[PDB]
Design a binder for this molecule. Sequence first.
Ligand code: FAD
Ligand SMILES: *[C@@H]1O[C@H](CO)[C@@H](O[C@@H]2O[C@H](CO)[C@@H](O)[C@H](O)[C@H]2NC(C)=O)[C@H](O)[C@H]1NC(C)=O
Ligand code: ZIR
Ligand code: NAG
Ligand code: NAG
Length: 498
Amino acid sequence: PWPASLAALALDGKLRTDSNATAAASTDFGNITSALPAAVLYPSSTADLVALLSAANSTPGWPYTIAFRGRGHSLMGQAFAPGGVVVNMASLGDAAAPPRINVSADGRYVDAGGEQVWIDVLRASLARGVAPRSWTDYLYLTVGGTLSNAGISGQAFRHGPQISNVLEMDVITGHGEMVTCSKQLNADLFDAVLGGLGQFGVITRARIAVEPAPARARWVRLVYTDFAAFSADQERLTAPRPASFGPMSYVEGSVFVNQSLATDLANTGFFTDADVARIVALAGERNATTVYSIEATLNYDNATAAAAAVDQELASVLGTLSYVEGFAFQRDVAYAAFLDRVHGEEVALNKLGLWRVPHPWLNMFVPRSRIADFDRGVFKGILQGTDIVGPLIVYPLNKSMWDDGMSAATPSEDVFYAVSLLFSSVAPNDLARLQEQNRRILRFCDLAGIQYKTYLARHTDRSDWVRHFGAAKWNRFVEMKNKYDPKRLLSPGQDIFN
Ligand SMILES: *Cc1cc2c(cc1C)nc1c(=O)[nH]c(=O)nc-1n2C[C@H](O)[C@H](O)[C@H](O)COP(=O)(O)OP(=O)(O)OC[C@H]1O[C@@H](n2cnc3c(N)ncnc32)[C@H](O)[C@@H]1O
Ligand SMILES: *[C@@H]1O[C@H](CO)[C@@H](O[C@@H]2O[C@H](CO)[C@@H](O)[C@H](O)[C@H]2NC(C)=O)[C@H](O)[C@H]1NC(C)=O
Ligand SMILES: CC(C)=CCNc1ncnc2c1ncn2[C@@H]1O[C@H](CO)[C@@H](O)[C@H]1O
Ligand SMILES: *[C@@H]1O[C@H](CO)[C@@H](O)[C@H](O)[C@H]1NC(C)=O
Ligand SMILES: *[C@@H]1O[C@H](CO)[C@@H](O)[C@H](O)[C@H]1NC(C)=O
């Protein structure tokens, strides 16, 4: 039998079993794995989510696993509920009254619904002259989705990931109980949920820290032929000052393989054809099989003295660095245009039919002491001679800005690198080849003794998830699963308890 509140959802057309509803919630960004759910819930309010989760907890032998689909940006089916119920989170923001994004009266934080996309959180914040401090490279992801992972970009070295910038949340547990949580109130749930992979409950609201909005971003690219000089400069730009960080607002980096150098430099959207020819000539002079580039920003406001002050600040920063003499490249954009820079590449790849293709992405955190071994074995090794489609992103992070009590797993070293090899598959020949190449990259790391952590990946073996979190942290994760999802129905696509 069905509880009155669960039957009401079906009666009001919120619970859909039609082929159109189930097919849309069966595919994800990865475009490698598919899993048809039994039904899709389109909730109009948080009471509808309470109704489904309470009906799940109060029904003996409830056989339906529950997933919370944000924008389905998952790579390997993490947002699916195979033969279960997929919640279409975007449906919470339909009404337009009451608002789902509210900047505080004091301008110190922003309240956003878990389903809200970061681009909208940015627009609503900017209208009040404020903006979140820590971002993702791509803004068309949900607050709830990015918080269930970590949420990383070039600001994470100084502000920590997005999980380190949450004051409090509203979470409906697997028991169907609406719970408000922070470090002071229900801290256990707050910590379990952040980096929690949708295992403990659905985030319906997150209170995000903000800062006064800068108006412009001075955006620079620095070119290296030497990995040692590239990595030493990224660590110098991101190192804490003797808590306190340097002037850079953002620090990322990219790897360019010699084989597709001219094409990949042109595809950045940053370099002119004159910049490309100079870098191509540089690589050939140096006899480089790889080229490296630091990507950095200096945020600033609409002040009269602003531009000249950033010119002087940047000149001082650049002087402390070791990039190839004369290889500093500058752009000056409005802040929101730099934040939403990846959206332009999505539009261009989709028109060429290269967005809805498989994405066998390899994302990992590599300890600082092993990055040069990673570069030799991977960028200078495994990847050489292959045709690479997609960016190769490498940048350091500071462990001090990460909370180890949260669910997100990071390497034990103080400095570690975000390594994101964003492979785009073209032919069927390519998908299988790209998947074997990722298996070979991880095998190289395992055999060399590199203590990495995967990011955005779901493991299929219990021994792998135990190693991912570390045994002591794994028991904490399990304790939290027994308190918040005893029925093991939430986010089954992570393959931890399902
Ligand atoms: C597609 C993509 C993803 C991406 C990126 C660029 C692109 C083009 N750039 C990223 C970056 O620079 N930094 C970063 O940290 N992540 C980046 N990603 C990955 C993105 O964070 C993830 O794909 C993530 O899953 C968020 O995406 P989305 O919002 O689309 O979430 P989902 O895939 O549907 O769900 C992921 C898992 O989380 C659970 N979930 C979703 N919403 C909630 C709420 N509100 N509460 C609790 N759990 C939730 C799902 O059930 C699923 O398990
Ligand atoms: C970088 O890659 C390019 C290949 O695209 C190399 O340039 C070519 O090398 C062969 C061998 O002598 C020539 O026959 C081709 O005509 C060259 N092509 C172009 C487009 O220049 C270059 O050798 C590579 N460098 C390193 C150090 O590996
Ligand atoms: C941790 C994870 C998953 C990060 C994923 N982020 C990104 N995802 C997809 N494309 C990106 C990303 N960052 C930059 N680009 C593109 O790469 C080039 C930047 O030089 C541009 O073409 C830009 O649009
Ligand atoms: C991949 O996407 C394409 C285009 O939408 C589609 O033909 C196919 O069903 C998808 N494959 C998977 C495994 O999701
Ligand atoms: C240039 O580099 C290649 C490949 O890295 C190497 O095998 C070759 O001997 C080099 N030639 C020089 C340095 O003159």
